[PDB]
């Protein structure tokens with residue numbers, strides 16, 4: 001509850017149908033980041049993909065224009081499993 | 093289940109090699125526990141992170157009154173946390189420094205507690221537990237608590253003094269290593285120092301491999317008998333833990 005990995009998740013650029021997200025990586029090595037996204041209304045299904053731990057950005061594409069979305073990212077430690085997630089909202 | 097937000101972090105109980113150990117209270121019930129911190133960057137620099145990950149799983153399954161309970165573990169960006177049972181009386185090492193040596197009633201009771209714990213471990217096919225005094229904690233009733241994770245404990249090394257001959261020569265070993273360790277510990281409890289102590293590694297190695305040791309005059313015949321039965325060079329000649337628990341010197345002096 002007090003911490004999350006990654007931190008400071010943000011949308012740095014966008015098109016009508018895509019988002020470029022960025023985050024701060026921790027010092028410790030991360031296996032990969034789990035990125036989920038879906039319509040904030042809670043009715044549409046959540047889509048999920050992974051991004052290698054060496055990356056600090058990712059592109060979310062195939063989005064609908066003018067829709068509220070919730071994006072969630074959490075890292076994975078090789079030995080100790082997942083970290084707590086961090087979530088943001090963005091309207092395309 | 094258990095997470096960092098569930099605990100209020102109290103005063104430090106002591107510092108380990110990779111971080112501090114704190115008295116802790118579960119927020120909802122105020123139940124007293126110990127929170128052990130191990131920095132990830134330190135674990136990796138020492139090359140023991142994999143070892144810690146494996147051993148927290150191992151220890152989480154060991155439920156015995158004389159084995160410190162490991163209730164769970166979690167992590168954040170920089171630390172690994174262990175939620176451990178709180179042993180309020182500290183290490184038996186500090187008790188031994190205070191008393192110089194233990195009498196036979198106190199020693200035989202300790203040996204009974206450890207023989208019980210080691211028999212439980214052996215029933216789980218887990219062997220070679222760390223029972224050096226510096227790594228044994230004491231419960232509220234003064235009962236011993238095996239901790240293991242000895243590499244994580246801040247202190248020369250005491251490991252060598254407790255290794256049986258098959259381990260110092262790096263040969264295949266079995267559950268009989270714990271019988272040898274028991275004999276080394278019984279001697280140190282009664283005498284105040286381990287039996288094979290020497291000022292160099294080669295000298296200590298020679299003493300262990302030859303089982304060269306002497307008893308001070310005050311060590312009684314029953315204690316000598318038990319210790320000598322345990323300190324056999326040939327592991328198969330060391331007794332069963334049941335024979336220790338039923339040894340006449342143990343049953344005459346143990347309060348358990």
Ligand SMILES: CO[C@@H](C(=O)N1Cc2[nH]nc(NC(=O)c3ccc(N4CCN(C)CC4)cc3)c2C1)c1ccccc1
Nearest residue numbers: 105108113126176177178179180181182226227239245
């Ligand atoms: C570094 O890890 C700790 C660890 O894992 N642990 C888990 C765990 N649980 N309870 C613990 N107790 C203490 O550390 C402690 C120290 C001094 C104390 N006092 C000093 C003298 N007494 C007369 C009054 C009270 C009372 C308790 C620990 C440490 C460890 C330390 C030593 C041996 C093995 C493990």
